[PDB]
Automatic annotation (TrEMBL), chains A, B:
Family: Belongs to the RIX1/PELP1 family.
Name of the protein this chain belongs to: Proline-, glutamic acid- and leucine-rich protein 1
The Pre-rRNA-processing protein RIX1 N-terminal domain, residue ranges: 21-179
Residues covered by the PELP1 middle domain: 348-395, 450-519
Amino acid sequence: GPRLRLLLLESVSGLLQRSAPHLPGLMCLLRLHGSVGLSALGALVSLSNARLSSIKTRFEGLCLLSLLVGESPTELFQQHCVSWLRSIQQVLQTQDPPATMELAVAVLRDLLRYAAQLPALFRDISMNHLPGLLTSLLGLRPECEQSALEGMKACMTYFPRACGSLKGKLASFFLSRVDALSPQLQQLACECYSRLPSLGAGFSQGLKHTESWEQELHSLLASLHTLLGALYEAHVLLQLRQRFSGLARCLGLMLSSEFGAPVSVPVQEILDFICRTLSVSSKNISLHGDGPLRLLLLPSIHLEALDLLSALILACGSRLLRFGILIGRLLPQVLNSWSILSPGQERPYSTVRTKVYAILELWVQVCGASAGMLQGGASGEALLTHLLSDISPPARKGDSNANSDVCAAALRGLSRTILMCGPLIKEETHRRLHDLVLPLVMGVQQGSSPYTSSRCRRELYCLLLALLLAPSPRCPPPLACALQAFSLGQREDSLEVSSFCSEALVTCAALTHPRVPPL
Amino acid sequence: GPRLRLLLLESVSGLLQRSAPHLPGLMCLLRLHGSVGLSALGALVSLSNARLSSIKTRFEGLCLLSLLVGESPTELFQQHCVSWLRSIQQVLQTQDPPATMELAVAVLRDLLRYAAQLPALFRDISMNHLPGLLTSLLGLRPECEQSALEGMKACMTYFPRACGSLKGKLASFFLSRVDALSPQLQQLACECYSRLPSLGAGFSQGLKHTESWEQELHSLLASLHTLLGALYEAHVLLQLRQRFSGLARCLGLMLSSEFGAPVSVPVQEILDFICRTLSVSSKNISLHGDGPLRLLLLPSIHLEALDLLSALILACGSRLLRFGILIGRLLPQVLNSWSILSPGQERPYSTVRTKVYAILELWVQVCGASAGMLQGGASGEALLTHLLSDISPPARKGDSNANSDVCAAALRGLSRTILMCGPLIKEETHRRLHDLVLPLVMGVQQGSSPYTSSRCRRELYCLLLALLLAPSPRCPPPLACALQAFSLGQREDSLEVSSFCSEALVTCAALTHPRVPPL
Amino acid sequence: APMEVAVCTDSAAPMWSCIVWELHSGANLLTYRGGQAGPRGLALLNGEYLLAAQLGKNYISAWELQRKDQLQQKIMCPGPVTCLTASPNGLYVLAGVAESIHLWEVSTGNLLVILSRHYQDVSCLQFTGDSSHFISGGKDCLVLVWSLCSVLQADPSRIPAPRHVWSHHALPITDLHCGFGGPLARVATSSLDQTVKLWEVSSGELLLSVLFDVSIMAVTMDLAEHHMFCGGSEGSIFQVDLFTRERSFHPGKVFKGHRNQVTCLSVSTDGSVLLSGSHDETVRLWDVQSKQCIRTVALKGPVTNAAILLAPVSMLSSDFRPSLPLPHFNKHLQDQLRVRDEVRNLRKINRDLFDFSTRFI
Amino acid sequence: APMEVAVCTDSAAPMWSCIVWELHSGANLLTYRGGQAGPRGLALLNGEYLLAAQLGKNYISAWELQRKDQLQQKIMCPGPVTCLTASPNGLYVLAGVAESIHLWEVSTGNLLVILSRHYQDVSCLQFTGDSSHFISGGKDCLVLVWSLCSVLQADPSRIPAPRHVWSHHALPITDLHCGFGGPLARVATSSLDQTVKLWEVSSGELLLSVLFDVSIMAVTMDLAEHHMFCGGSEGSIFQVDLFTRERSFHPGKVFKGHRNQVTCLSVSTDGSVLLSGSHDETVRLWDVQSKQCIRTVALKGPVTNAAILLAPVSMLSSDFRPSLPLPHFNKHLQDQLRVRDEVRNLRKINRDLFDFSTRFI
């Protein structure tokens, strides 16, 4: 050696002062060698500071300081972190191009992450520097607002207590950006706004933090209800749609992000809001005035409600078991809302159906065998009919892999549901699945179908293995036909399909050659 | 509816002529509704052409034409494809900002993909327009060179025969960019250059194409050998490194890409080159003059050779079985070359080891039970020792998930190798794996270790299931302990780990409750 | 299996009510005092709380794993508590209150449902591995299998019904054991009719039935279900090999050394070590292979509870505190939770950093 | 199972040498003429070529699946060819030339290795499902299990050795059948010593041995290995249930209707239909459940080959041509291939397009 490579870099740094474009490659090589992790380190630090001092070589010094922060020894880091932080803060107010600001913010995020784990350095950095760093981040140019957000995020991730004094001001910086047409800026603003309740001291074992979190969630729910009522009552409709999406994404991020203190999650209120959003399908809108614009905007509102439901499911887990009835009534309702051809082409509303099937898969994942999916009732029957319609192939301009992606999502949902709830599932469902899937796997190996994509074939083989693994106790699965299908698929050209078929054949050998006598 | 939404968009297009930022969102909604994919379509086409005619509203018309090409009916597309192509070509020579050029190139790629599948339209577009489109793409500004490449790629993907007349010129455009410090530009240039042998008529069932492919491969091998000999003989060393990486990536792309005609792949020559590249580990370089720079550059050369080996494995499949001895001697040699601490921190040369383990996993995937890995000999023993060292946890500034990623790669390789070759593998290997893995899975649920990442825990549970599924016939696997570990992991907070443990428990129930008597 | 521990309670409880001691060491890792836990009335909630149904009382006491005499608040019940269990995921608490089953959710403490399908007092409650189903046995000689989904999602107008009703036993059920899994799990029941029955949860079928010459007061199986250990009413433990509907055990497969009825049976994770608590005021530790008593521990009264379990970080860390406090469990018929190891790896952060560096260039 | 077909060859072959006909229809889907294929000498290479070891000759003929009389080039061998097989992946061709096994790679046509471990003529060659191992049986009463990895990666100085040598049979081997899988596969062998043996490939152990009163000339199993069908030397097919090391079959499990020795046995994918070719110049199609002859097809000579297999797109598409020509197979001791369905999906292209559109803004 490390000393030899470090001395090499110090000596051949004279190319900079032209190997500036080569500097990132050399720097990746230096961190790959692990030479950093001390006269050589001190010389590198001094050269980095000298480069940062100038206004034309700031990129080189910033890269050097990025490497230093990345792989400093715990001794060098403690003694030089304050100087590096001051240099980064000074660079953050230089009227530099936004790429320099982005690099400085990334380095600052690394520095703050590595400084928060040193109790002696943490408190010093916090009290003596964090308000100034936040003020500098708030003072960036509009063109660099994106960068500022990451910096703010960093300050709110590792130093939350010291961000409280400016918390309200930070809020003014976030509401302005949650209604932003740029998806990355809007997502980052939502992520920053979701961290507001965690700022401050949080006295009494985070009681203040819990109260702030609950108040923010209730305010977001009220605002979402007002926006939804306004939407369902030209440019203004688009503005309300954007604000609704931003607010709902903020609420979903608050649901599905780490928080310091325990909180009380109102499940009934969020579920009532989701149902209210999903309860306008196609006919309540009608067609008059701005009615067609509402009809155009409706799938985006439905997708945003589905994202909210996904976040709630992730946050709560199996605790939503007593609302599973509502969830299993909601899923086929959304499927019925957006269901509508020539072979090939593409069915409309495919994204909404994929989101619904992902919701189904996630729900089965978090609820295990208690998900209660495809287990009787009108809602389960409707969901199964939609799934079987979306996985069936459609039996001149078009795509060879037509409707492949909804097919793959439905296959994933069906295979997970079968693997986890197959014994509980009725035998007619299993027989229908066999009669639909066995000809499919036999015919994919032997036109324009969803199964021209290898991912769909992999999901179909996964569903076949799930039917073998979790069958009805009263309906034995077709083992020989599935074995033939797996043998055919292990000779397929696609690597993922053949590999899955090999592993599935190993599992089927376990299934076919028992090790202990049965009972 | 569709007619209502299309008429809506036509009427509320007066916002453009300000909802221009809202136009992409409206356009995504329009393609999600499936309203396109015919008076409304004709009006939309006319409005798009009018917008493209002006120099300030070109983005709006380009977006509209993108949607039209995306979801046109096969009747409208045939009648308007020539006009859309001419408009795109006209836009491609306008001295517009590079974002407009990128959008136009994306739309052109979609148009060419959808036009090549219509035999009547294909030949007309080809002969009457493709040379002019290629000339326009070659004539773009340097700042838009990136964009040009995609366009060229499109022209070489769907209209290869008509690109032959300019093929040589295209080559001059690609060699200049394969030695490019921008990773995206270099990758795109390599992808474009790998398509050169497929251009032209290709007479005699692609005999000319096969000959051109073989000649290009041999020329690339000779150039790579010359570059490697020069490297192992300041700024010039970096230039040769960049050229070596570009040429080797071109060769790997030629190996692992679709080609029209059958070709003869020289496996011995490429393997000899890979071995020659990998045969300089640490001591041949020494330390004098530019020696340390060669030592710095060496891991990148080794990684590029490993990428070449990966491409060769993907291209050839199980046909490399008779070179598997060389492959299994190479892998532990590279592991020994880059092996070097305090708990936590990070081991150096981690990327090279991850690449080696990915090579191992891919080799097992393509060779099945014939991979012959960990099945006796010094090379297999060395590989196993390296794997077990890289998956063992290391039993103040640092990362909690230290060395997690090499651990995950080694776990994936080990689990795939066990699942596919476990019965052939000796029992002492299985016992060592049990003694190392069972305490690990029991202790992850109960400091700074690689297994603080959920992905490593998921891979460890996958390895446990592989040991259960493919054990030695003479060494029974520990079933009760693995069941306890899976039960503990299904209650883990991480969703992926708990879901995998649930599915693994279903598989273990299949393994524990036989359905037929044994033999 | 890092430090398997044995958790034992007796009836007298002069100075200690519960004792946690290492299997191979025998030293008292942890102690708890305050009451007298009843049979089948000991549970670990979420690996962080110790719930004990008080013997002959109408309430359930709670302890923290790291604090002695940590009895603070009680779970009031309308009648006497006969059995108590917690779901392995730690989300629900079941108590047998007379002939009924009370279900509480640990998230809110609400009394979710009172199932009154048994016409006699409930003797034992068990969960499956994944908490999808729970099995109840009572002195009504019935074994009821309840789907948690059906029980939780029931309109109070239509009372929940058991997924399965099993009435093959002729005398009151004394113990239940559930294997790993959910629908694919198997349940072992033992009765005073000298019979141990193995059922399949999903099909509801009777897989096996073994008859003994004495009443079977306890039953358990190893995780791999290789064997089945049945503790009788005369201090004799029988081992039945599940590798061989309607058998009839007849007397090398029996453990000798207990004097009074063996009421608690537990098997270590590896299945080589067996724990047995009896009414002779003794907990014995046996080698499964050699049928030899490894260890004998004397208590001050008849053993009511005894189990082998993997010690969580709670029992090992002397500074452990529960993440959430125990809620107030309502006596009559949002979610409190912590919202939230997917941290970016090392080439994750490095690839982000060099993407930024390249984007500068 | 879309259109399972039966591929049959006889000895006389007056006008047709090979016939492919639908199982449930019986109409000749395809025909081939030119020679007389020998026993065990019929193979399908890569689902696109038909290789036939000529009866009593030193060469192997080839046909394209869509062309009659498509005999063009021959695989010369130093001696007479007794058996012929191709790996299921279509990469290798094995031929039994006298006492030796010649291995060719279809990619280049090179004679990779000549294994001469048998001291008598090789009677039959089989591959496993994943082509990892191949099993050879000869008149030397030996069953040899070869790892393809070991055989291909051998220095010509050190001759390759079998992974397993099985000498439990006392009379020459007449047939081999390999189950699905590689190391975990099972192999059924049948001998003139009236015995059918089931072995495990990995451990090399003998799992089962069934003794009959007549010599067993053919053997096969279904994919799930539920049953085992053994065709004897008197025209009787026996079914042995593998759900029950050393048995002894004694005489409802036997198929009646063949007169001379049954030499070919094949089972449909579902296992409900059995194909049997005999020396009585007849191929019979049986219902497995009812043991009743569904169909009888008369040929012009003793049946040498008969199999049931899923018809590839080659047999269904009348315009099919092989992707690669057959190489020249060298007579004495880079890669020619097509380099390299991962096409971007619909939100793949849409997400790329809207990323571009947003990047403009």
